[PDB]
Amino acid sequence: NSTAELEELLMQRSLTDPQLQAAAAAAADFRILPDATVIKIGGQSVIDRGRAAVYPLVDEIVAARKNHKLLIGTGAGTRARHLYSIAAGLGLPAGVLAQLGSSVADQNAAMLGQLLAKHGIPVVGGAGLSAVPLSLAEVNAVVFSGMPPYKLWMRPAAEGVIPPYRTDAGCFLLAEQFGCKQMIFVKDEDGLYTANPKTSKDATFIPRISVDEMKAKGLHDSILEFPVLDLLQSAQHVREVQVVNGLVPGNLTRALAGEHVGTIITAS
Amino acid sequence: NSTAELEELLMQRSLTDPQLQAAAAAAADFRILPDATVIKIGGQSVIDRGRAAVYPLVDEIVAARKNHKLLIGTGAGTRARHLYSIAAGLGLPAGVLAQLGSSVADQNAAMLGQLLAKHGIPVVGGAGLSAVPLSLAEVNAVVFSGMPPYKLWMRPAAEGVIPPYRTDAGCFLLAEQFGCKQMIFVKDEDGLYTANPKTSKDATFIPRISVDEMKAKGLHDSILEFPVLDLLQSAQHVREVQVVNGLVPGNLTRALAGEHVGTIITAS
Amino acid sequence: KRPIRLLPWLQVVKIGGRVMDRGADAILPLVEELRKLLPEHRLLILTGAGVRARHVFSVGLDLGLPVGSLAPLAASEAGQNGHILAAMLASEGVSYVEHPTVADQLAIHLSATRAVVGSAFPPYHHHEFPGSRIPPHRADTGAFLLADAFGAAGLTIVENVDGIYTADPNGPDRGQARFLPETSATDLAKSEGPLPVDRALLDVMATARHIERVQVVNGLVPGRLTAALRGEHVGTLIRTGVRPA
Amino acid sequence: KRPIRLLPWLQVVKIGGRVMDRGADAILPLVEELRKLLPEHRLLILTGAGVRARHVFSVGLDLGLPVGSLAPLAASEAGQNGHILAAMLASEGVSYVEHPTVADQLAIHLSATRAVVGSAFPPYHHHEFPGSRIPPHRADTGAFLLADAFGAAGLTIVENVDGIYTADPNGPDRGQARFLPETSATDLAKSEGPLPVDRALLDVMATARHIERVQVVNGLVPGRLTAALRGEHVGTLIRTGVRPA
Amino acid sequence: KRPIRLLPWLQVVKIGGRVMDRGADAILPLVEELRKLLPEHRLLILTGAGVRARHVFSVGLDLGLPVGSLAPLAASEAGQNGHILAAMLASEGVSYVEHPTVADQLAIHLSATRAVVGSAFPPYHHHEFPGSRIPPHRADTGAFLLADAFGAAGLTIVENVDGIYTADPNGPDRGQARFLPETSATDLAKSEGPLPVDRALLDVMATARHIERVQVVNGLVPGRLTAALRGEHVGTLIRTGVRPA
Amino acid sequence: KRPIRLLPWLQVVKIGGRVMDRGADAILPLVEELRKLLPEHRLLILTGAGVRARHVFSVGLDLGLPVGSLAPLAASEAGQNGHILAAMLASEGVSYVEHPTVADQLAIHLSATRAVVGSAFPPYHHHEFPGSRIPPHRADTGAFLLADAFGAAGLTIVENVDGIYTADPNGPDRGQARFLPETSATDLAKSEGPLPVDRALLDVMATARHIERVQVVNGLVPGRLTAALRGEHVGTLIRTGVRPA
Ligand SMILES: Nc1ncnc2c1ncn2[C@@H]1O[C@H](COP(=O)(O)OP(=O)(O)OP(=O)(O)O)[C@@H](O)[C@H]1O
Ligand SMILES: Nc1ncnc2c1ncn2[C@@H]1O[C@H](COP(=O)(O)OP(=O)(O)OP(=O)(O)O)[C@@H](O)[C@H]1O
Ligand SMILES: Nc1ncnc2c1ncn2[C@@H]1O[C@H](COP(=O)(O)OP(=O)(O)OP(=O)(O)O)[C@@H](O)[C@H]1O
Ligand SMILES: Nc1ncnc2c1ncn2[C@@H]1O[C@H](COP(=O)(O)OP(=O)(O)OP(=O)(O)O)[C@@H](O)[C@H]1O
Ligand SMILES: [Cl-]
Ligand SMILES: [Cl-]
Ligand SMILES: [Mg+2]
Ligand SMILES: [Mg+2]
Ligand SMILES: [Mg+2]
Ligand SMILES: [Mg+2]
């Protein structure tokens, strides 16, 4: 197992060759932004609710950036569901719907960014994310739009044309790519329940669970849907995520302080 | 008068409906950059004059950014008048002339920005203005090109093809949009006079005047032309502007300190 | 004299966002009618925003945002309608193009293909005018500014109603609303009450240099757009007060 | 029902990066064959990456970089192959176009000219999936996602070998490698061992909505691409498991 | 051997900024002549900068700015002349395209339409060469680099004078200025004194691979551009010192 | 060596006269399928004669007329079917062209428009061969002679049956008729019994220089012509016994 042996396989075999795959897996592992936390602010669960949900979270973001480095991604929400409904009724494929959804997450990032601008926190994007390093170094936070960039190359789900990789997946993959220390999803329920809590009671709260236990329990729908949970099981750097209720004052602050509010979902 | 009542009108009526218009007017009013000042550096009145005008103002900008947050926009000036003359003689419409003028204001912003670069002050632009928050937070100043982005969608004047909304209007509208605390136009005369001072004397200096008084006095031409003065009467956040002579050493510094140099023009 | 016409052979068609909001039931017939118009006219098809812009206004106003924040948020929804409509016409060689491309390279794109789709909102961005908390320069206004700047042969506004009435025919006073086959922009600008077109449209018609009339027609009735593009009177004519050369 | 086809008349052709790596000896005959195909088909020609992506993987892995860093670095090399191939076809009106343009304005570009060249890699950028240190969604995978999303008439994969064999015909076990004239993606996905196509290609074939078969042919033999674009069986057919409508 | 020609059928025409500076009196006849050339040639029309670049040089030099600052400021003025000229030809399907588009997608644009307009300045930006405080690689130089890189059929330089003289025919020594019907770049490069073309043009002609001659003609005389594009001798021929293949 | 291909990018499609005889019920779906093929292929669409040629044979034989009299009388009916089909495609730019024009100016007509319609009968007129009282060189034969002379990319024969069977599937022995997915012309020429194609077609396939296979497909099933033009196997393949170059 040498660097010369890896380079020799990389020149002589297909990238599909299991021997090459395994030598590449022994490569060193550099974390690009190891001290940062990725947070997703929900689109339907938070930003679509307006000032009563958003303003307290802006206050928490401003207080947090003193001790914490934050990459803050936005969900899409009800305008994307409207676009998906129109487009799906026309027979358009998942790759066309994917671009429509990104425009809604971009709107939400612009609105959140305008509330944060006087604190120096910018909105960033483009295929390079090139404004992230300097912003994180100087003001300890940046806002980005949460949809992945796949556009027409979006992988479809097994059934239907709704893009399976949306803003939960987009934020998760950025945490995984940057090697961040923590991934927090900010939604509108306290965490995972054995049923979903909006449509049934004696749903029981679950403080901690693995992805395999969620599948084996048959936990369907749920506050995080399965495409992001499968990415989590494959991840190299981010091997658990926390889901918290952003409508509860101070929940994001407390999660960033290491309090176990919400549900922790582990890859294994 | 509720948030639910506004949302109900927004779904059920035309945006032209006076009842919707009035409910929207009762919305809360968020100022995006309330502690910033917008300054316009004149194109024909300052930058076209070269080093003797520009270098002292660069010094004042560098000194000011210690206590003041500045958005510094540039005028266009004599190269834009040349372009307008060529294009108008060909019969081209105001929307074509508008793009020509923006290129000249962009040139002037690049020249000013190069004199400020060693102090860390950047030139910013693009439809998002996305470099403004971090720059203002860290170095307390940014340079931008003063023409509005209307391009081919520029509203024409009642007569002729010269774009009516140029760099005075462009800078003013950014101050109004960001909710800035102050708008200062830096030109080459001490302020407003009862005649314009380059072409007649016993012109009397006017320290303070409302837009209605300017119209009623029949003050025509003038150091600010009427399209920006009408925007001022409609403004929500910036309800007066100050015009100062940037050729006088320290006038910009003194205006930023609250001294009443120049002319103050009030919306009412 | 008045400015020259840049694209005198162009026909501009603005599709209301609320037509798109009806989904396949309205869009499929309209796409079929557009398909049949491609060999007859050179078309710039511009989409408005519709109900999703009302939702983002609701959120942005609840957050306190100013009118220069809300204008590009609504313009985004018109862009999405444009992407949907162009996707349906892709097999005819039709694509959506963005504002910079419409401003500067429309002539070459209309040489490449029979029609292009764009946003009807103008790129006023954070430089929208103050006064109302609702952005004034919306889809009707942007489409007319472009059509008149180009000196196009016409602008047709395709709506979910037959034309202009004396009151909102879907609103509280719908019982006394009577249809107006023809009106002038100056007469409309003197009225109070809602219209199916932006009030700023009437203002830019007063300064217009080329377009003499704009017809508002019901795009939910197959054939009306086709007839309007031939000058047939099938909705409301708005006279702009441009006088012939 | 399944989604509509956006560009049903389109033919997509993916050119392997290792074909380009052979230089003029392989590229000139291939350019001559493409030139003769322009009057027969409407072509989206997509290039893969080849050996330079192996080199940047070698450097990036030695530096410890994650898979979301390596994906755009490899995609860059496919873009460079595309610029080279388009330059050779410039005199026929062919240019290279970037990802945003392929995603949104392909229809107008294929109305302007008979063929365009693009990158076969998808724009997954820093959002590539984790699990392998080698980016999984590469040139075969990107080209198939695009072809199927468009509902194109076909996708042909042009390689430096005759097709798929039971073992790498240039590798250690080349002696027992036997040629497969036809296979199914599900059968290939159950095998272990290297393939001439991305393993993620088999996964996206399982969710495909339109493309029923993909042929892999040897672009080093003049005439095979021409024959494949007419449906003639001259390499390996991969059945996707899309069932006819 | 020499490199291949990318666009051998292209004709490149550089329009001097000072021709544009004369306004409608010079531009309208020239636009009419270009209109009549569109069915005869495939044209890349490139504009120079003219007097406004002198003004921005005056300001930028008074501010002390280096040559890499002044080069893009002058290039901006050539871009504005290009937007003006394209606007006048919009009704013929002609648009202005920017540097990235000229570099990479010219072939598809010339398939879409008969002519495109661009800037004649090259994108040297802050990487302009030092030595003079005046940017050396200006409009004549950029247009020749592009024409020769493309392997175009010709480059014609359209000026406000009949051609090259032995002294500036508008300057102090205008009395002893005699017209040169033909010269070589090497002979011109050995002379001192002003020319109607960039001195860097002579340097890039020495390294040229395809263009054998460039004609400088008076665009204020209707018909001379038309004649030059047919090879008729109506101004000054500059031999580049490329030898035939 | 074999002769060059004159129009190698052409697809030839022969429409059986008995498909046309079914009227709107068969023709409208077929016209819709052809409409969708125009952006995908360059088509020469040739019509056969059908039942009216049987009637004129009945009259002409009762009058005693020789085979050189009956050949142009049948060819007239194929021409009329061609005029009907072209009229249905006129709005797509499609016209019928006569024999002299097909023989000499097809290339320019296929540059003007995506498809043209002609008669599938050859102009043998009073020079038809003797031996049978029924003209031997009919619509299948004429279409194949033209396709092979042009060196076209294919010839597809569109019939009112799935393909060739071992007996007439509409005739007396229809019970023992079994479908033949693939056959050779030489095998068919050795059989006795009726076929859905002219027997002279088998003879001209023996002397053919380019076309290797001809597919016979059911034009009463939407989609089969589309699939056949992509090389998909959906009817009977006839191998001609041309060997690849
Ligand atoms: N006087 C009037 N006459 C006709 N319609 C009116 C009038 N007043 C209000 N309306 C309303 O205007 C509605 C159209 O709503 P709106 O005009 O905003 O939609 P749109 O034009 O499709 O949206 P967009 O402006 O984003 O394209 C009509 O359905 C009608 O109810
Ligand atoms: N089972 C197999 N059958 C055929 N070829 C195989 C097989 N396994 C490995 N290979 C190898 O795959 C090689 C192609 O390498 P690769 O497929 O990466 O090149 P490419 O497709 O040109 O590159 P890119 O994916 O960047 O376009 C063949 O030359 C062959 O040696
Ligand atoms: N030897 C010469 N022969 C001809 N003209 C000369 C000579 N020396 C100087 N000139 C001058 O060059 C002038 C052209 O100025 P210049 O060449 O810069 O304009 P331009 O080419 O239109 O500008 P740009 O280079 O921006 O396109 C002529 O009008 C003439 O006065
Ligand atoms: N062995 C066979 N297999 C298939 N069809 C056969 C066979 N023998 C006879 N037929 C008949 O041939 C018929 C087609 O008649 P014919 O082929 O003359 O029509 P057509 O090709 O439409 O006419 P035209 O030759 O004028 O275009 C079929 O409907 C079928 O009944
Ligand atoms: Cl705050
Ligand atoms: Cl300094
Ligand atoms: Mg409306
Ligand atoms: Mg491969
Ligand atoms: Mg010159
Ligand atoms: Mg038959």
Where are any strands of DSSP class E within chain F?
10-15, 42-47, 115-119, 154-159, 182-184, 213-218, 236-239
Pick the closest to residue D215 from D164, D177, D166, D160 (CA basis).
D164
Substitution candidate for ligand 3 out of E160, E162, E202 with most atoms within 8 A of CB: E160
Whether ligand 4 lies within 6 angstroms of the CB of F49 is answered as: yes
Where are any strands of DSSP class E within B96-140?
123-124
Inspect the interface and report whether the beta carbons of D107 and C113 lie closer than 8 Å.
yes
User: Which residues of chain A make contact with B126, given a CB cutoff of 8 A?
Assistant: none
Nearest residue (by CA) to ligand 2, atom 14, is D196
- The residue type of A195 is A
Given a contact cutoff of 8 angstroms between Cβ atoms, the answer to whether E158 and E217 are in contact is: yes
Cα–Cα separations (whole angstroms), residue A57 to A49, A54, A62, A121, F238? 12, 5, 9, 14, 73
Inspect the interface and report whether the beta carbons of B176 and C68 lie closer than 8 Å.
yes
User: Which residues of chain D make contact with F231, given a CB cutoff of 8 A?
Assistant: 230-232
Nearest residue, CB atoms, F40 vs list D9, D39, D230? D9
Phi, psi of C16 (to 5 degrees): -65, 140
Q: Where does ligand 1 bind, in terms of residues with CB under 6 Å? A: B 14-15; C 16-19, 48-50, 138-139, 159-161, 164-165, 167-170, 194-196
* Alpha carbons B172 and B185: distance in angstroms, whole number: 9
Q: Which chains touch F (3 or more CB pairs under 8 A)?
A: D
Resolution (A): 1.9
Read off the tokens for F143.
């279409």
Specify which residues E214 forms β-bridges with: E238
Inspect the interface and report whether the beta carbons of C105 and E96 lie closer than 8 Å.
yes
Specify which residues D83 forms β-bridges with: none
Inspect the interface and report whether the beta carbons of A90 and C28 lie closer than 8 Å.
yes
Strand order in the sheet with B36-41: B123-124, B141-145, B69-74, B36-41, B182-187, B240-245, B263-266, B208-210
Substitution candidate for ligand 1 out of B14, B16, B19 with most atoms within 8 A of CB: B14
Given the DSSP bridges, would you call strands C236-239 and C213-218 parallel, antiparallel or unpaired?
Answer: antiparallel
Q: Which residues contact B13 (CB under 8 A, 6 or more apart)?
A: B19, B20, C168, C171, C194
* Alpha carbons B48 and B77: distance in angstroms, whole number: 7
E143 touches chain C (CB under 8 A): no
Nearest chain D residue to A98 by CA distance is D103
Whether ligand 4 lies within 6 angstroms of the CB of F142 is answered as: no
Substitution candidate for ligand 4 out of F52, F164, F168, F187 with most atoms within 8 A of CB: F168
Q: Which chains touch A (3 or more CB pairs under 8 A)?
A: B, C, D
D8 touches chain F (CB under 8 A): yes
Nearest chain D residue to A24 by CA distance is D133
Read off the tokens for A50.
């307006």
Burial level of D176, CB count in 10 A (0-12/13-18/19+)? exposed
Q: How many Cβ atoms sit within 10 Å of the Cβ of residue E127?
A: 9
Size of interface A-B (CB pairs under 8 A): 44
Where are any strands of DSSP class E within chain D?
10-15, 42-47, 115-119, 154-159, 182-184, 213-218, 236-239
Read off the tokens for E85.
């000229």
Nearest chain C residue to E82 by CA distance is C104
Looking at the CA of E236, name the nearest ligand.
3
User: Which residues of chain D make contact with A174, given a CB cutoff of 8 A?
Assistant: 126-127
Chains F and A: 3 or more CB pairs within 8 Å of each other: no
Phi, psi of D10 (to 5 degrees): -80, 145
Burial level of A144, CB count in 10 A (0-12/13-18/19+)? buried
Chains E and A: 3 or more CB pairs within 8 Å of each other: no
* Alpha carbons C80 and C103: distance in angstroms, whole number: 19
Specify which residues A241 forms β-bridges with: A265
* CA count, 13 A, side-chain hemisphere, E191: 16
Residue located via tokens 């472009």:
C146
Pick the closest to residue C94 from D106, D114, D108 (CA basis).
D108
Whether ligand 3 lies within 6 angstroms of the CB of E81 is answered as: no
Inspect the interface and report whether the beta carbons of B111 and E73 lie closer than 8 Å.
yes
Alpha helices by DSSP H, listed for chain A, are 3-12, 18-25, 51-64, 78-89, 94-116, 132-139, 167-178, 211-216, 226-234, 251-256
Read off the tokens for A26.
């022994």
Whether ligand 3 lies within 6 angstroms of the CB of E45 is answered as: no
Given a contact cutoff of 8 angstroms between Cβ atoms, the answer to whether E13 and E147 are in contact is: no
Determine the atom of ligand 2 nearest the C-alpha atom of D138.
25
Specify which residues B185 forms β-bridges with: B40, B243
Burial level of B158, CB count in 10 A (0-12/13-18/19+)? exposed
Distance from CA of A82 to the nearest CA of D (A): 18
- The residue type of D48 is G
Cα–Cα separations (whole angstroms), residue A136 to A139, B43, D233, F126? 6, 36, 56, 90
Pick the closest to residue B106 from D59, C130, A64, E77 (CA basis).
E77
User: Which residues of chain C make contact with E113, given a CB cutoff of 8 A?
Assistant: 107-108, 111-112
Write down the CATH superfamily of domain E1-245: Acetylglutamate kinase-like (3.40.1160.10)
Q: Which residues contact F2 (CB under 8 A, 6 or more apart)?
A: F209, F210, F245
Looking at the CA of C50, name the nearest ligand.
1
Distance from CA of A86 to the nearest CA of C (A): 5
The crossing angle, in degrees rounded to 10, of helices A167-178 and A226-234 is 10
* Alpha carbons F137 and F121: distance in angstroms, whole number: 7
Task: Assign 3-class secondary structure to A22-43.
Answer: HHHHCCCCCCCCCCEEEEEECC
Whether ligand 2 lies within 6 angstroms of the CB of A14 is answered as: yes
Given the DSSP bridges, would you call strands E10-15 and B205-206 parallel, antiparallel or unpaired?
Answer: unpaired
Best probe of the C interface among A90, A99, A100, A161, by most C CBs < 10 A, is: A90
Inspect the interface and report whether the beta carbons of B94 and C51 lie closer than 8 Å.
no
Given a contact cutoff of 8 angstroms between Cβ atoms, the answer to whether C77 and C47 are in contact is: no
Across B135-151, b (16+ Cβ under 10 Å) vs e yields bbbbbbbbbbbbbbbbb
* Alpha carbons E34 and E29: distance in angstroms, whole number: 9
Read off the tokens for B44.
């024909």
Nearest residue (by CA) to ligand 2, atom 12, is D196
* Alpha carbons E205 and E213: distance in angstroms, whole number: 9
Given a contact cutoff of 8 angstroms between Cβ atoms, the answer to whether D236 and D181 are in contact is: yes
Measured in angstroms, how far is the CA atom of residue C171 from the centroid of ligand 1? 10
- The residue type of E165 is Y
Give the DSSP per-residue string, E10-23.
Answer: EEEEEEPHHHHHTT
Read off the tokens for A41.
């602010």
Determine the atom of ligand 2 nearest the C-alpha atom of D170.
31
Task: Give the distance, in angstroms, between the CA of residue A58 and the centroid of all CA atoms in the same chain.
Answer: 18
Chains E and B: 3 or more CB pairs within 8 Å of each other: yes
User: Measured in Å, how far apart are chain C's first and last C-alpha atoms?
Assistant: 9
Q: Which chains touch D (3 or more CB pairs under 8 A)?
A: A, C, E, F
* Alpha carbons B72 and E15: distance in angstroms, whole number: 36
User: Measured in Å, how far apart are chain E's first and last C-alpha atoms?
Assistant: 9
Q: What is the signed CA dihedral for C107, C111, C117, C120, rounded to 10 degrees?
A: 20
Determine the atom of ligand 1 nearest the C-alpha atom of C180.
3
Q: What is the signed CA dihedral for F176, F181, F185, F188, rounded to 10 degrees?
A: -10
Read off the tokens for D13.
């052709």
Measured in angstroms, how far is the CA atom of residue B65 from the centroid of ligand 6? 13
E56 touches chain B (CB under 8 A): yes
Read off the tokens for A179.
């090697």
Given a contact cutoff of 8 angstroms between Cβ atoms, the answer to whether B252 and B53 are in contact is: no
Sequence spans of domains, chain A: 1-268
Written out in words, the top-level CATH class of the domain with range A1-268 is: alpha beta
Given the DSSP bridges, would you call strands C182-184 and C236-239 parallel, antiparallel or unpaired?
Answer: parallel
* Alpha carbons D170 and C5: distance in angstroms, whole number: 65
Where are any strands of DSSP class E within B28-100?
36-41, 69-74
Pick the closest to residue F36 from E173, C35, C188, C68 (CA basis).
C35
Given the DSSP bridges, would you call strands D42-47 and D115-119 parallel, antiparallel or unpaired?
Answer: parallel
Specify which residues E179 forms β-bridges with: E165
Inspect the interface and report whether the beta carbons of D112 and C116 lie closer than 8 Å.
no
Determine the atom of ligand 4 nearest the C-alpha atom of F165.
3
User: Which residues of chain E make contact with B87, given a CB cutoff of 8 A?
Assistant: 84
Whether ligand 3 lies within 6 angstroms of the CB of E88 is answered as: no
Looking at the CA of D235, name the nearest ligand.
2
Where residue E15 falls (left for φ over 0; alpha for ψ -120 to 50; beta otherwise) is beta
* Alpha carbons A180 and E222: distance in angstroms, whole number: 68
Read off the tokens for D218.
């040897």
Nearest residue (by CA) to ligand 4, atom 28, is F196
